[PDB]
């Protein structure tokens, strides 16, 4: 359990601090496991609205979202699940998401649309900033060139059909460096 715990803490911390973006539904499912872990089996009479310090159970973007009902529902559903079992499930649930282990940046697409741009050792993904759904994915091995200016970042994957991919961001350089270091190994 001491070893299982580290993994759990790591996975939990990334969801909670926002490094690992997840959907509202998922975040609430995670908090349900977290509740089982920290308070044991759900007690309807005490584990009710106002009981949780929400900032300790949900990503910041979902605190003002009235998620306590869904949280306690997920908690109640764990039944008498053990702390160990609850942690393994939490860890695996995080591993099951395509957003897992992805470095995300928040950008604006063409009224502009906020969007989560993710980079990994092998690809670039466009993810809905709200539902956290993978909308599109590119393979890094197909990267041709890129342009990063103080207020934008553009990628060219050599795709004639739709053209280039350009978004508003002040982190263009940060992203370019992540990409350059990764292709140094794959290309």
């Amino acid at each position: 359990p001491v070893q299982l715990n580290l993994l759990y803490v790591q996975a939990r911390d990334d969801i909670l601090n926002g490094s690992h973006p997840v959907s509202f539904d998922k975040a609430c499912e995670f908090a349900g496991y977290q509740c089982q872990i920290q308070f044991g089996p759900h007690n309807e009479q005490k584990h009710k609205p106002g009981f949780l310090e929400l900032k300790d159970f949900l990503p910041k973007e979902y605190i003002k979202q009235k998620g306590e009902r869904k949280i306690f529902m997920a908690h109640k559903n764990c039944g008498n699940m053990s702390e160990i079992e609850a942690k393994v499930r939490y860890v695996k649930l995080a591993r099951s998401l395509k957003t897992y282990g992805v470095s995300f940046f928040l950008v604006k697409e063409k009224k502009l649309v906020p969007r989560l741009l993710g980079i990994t050792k092998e690809c670039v993904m466009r993810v809905d900033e709200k539902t956290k759904e993978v909308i599109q994915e590119w393979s890094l091995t197909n990267i041709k060139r890129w342009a990063a200016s103080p207020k934008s970042f553009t990628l060219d994957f050599g795709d004639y059909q739709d053209g280039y991919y350009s978004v508003q961001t002040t982190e263009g350089e940060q992203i370019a460096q992540l990409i350059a270091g990764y292709i140094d190994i794959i290309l």
Binding site: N142, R145, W146, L187
Partner: peptide
């Protein structure tokens, strides 16, 4: 755009 080539062999070689 002031591009930075990726020097990707797929396109370069």
């Amino acid at each position: 755009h002031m591009w930075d080539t990726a020097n990707n062999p797929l396109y370069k070689e």
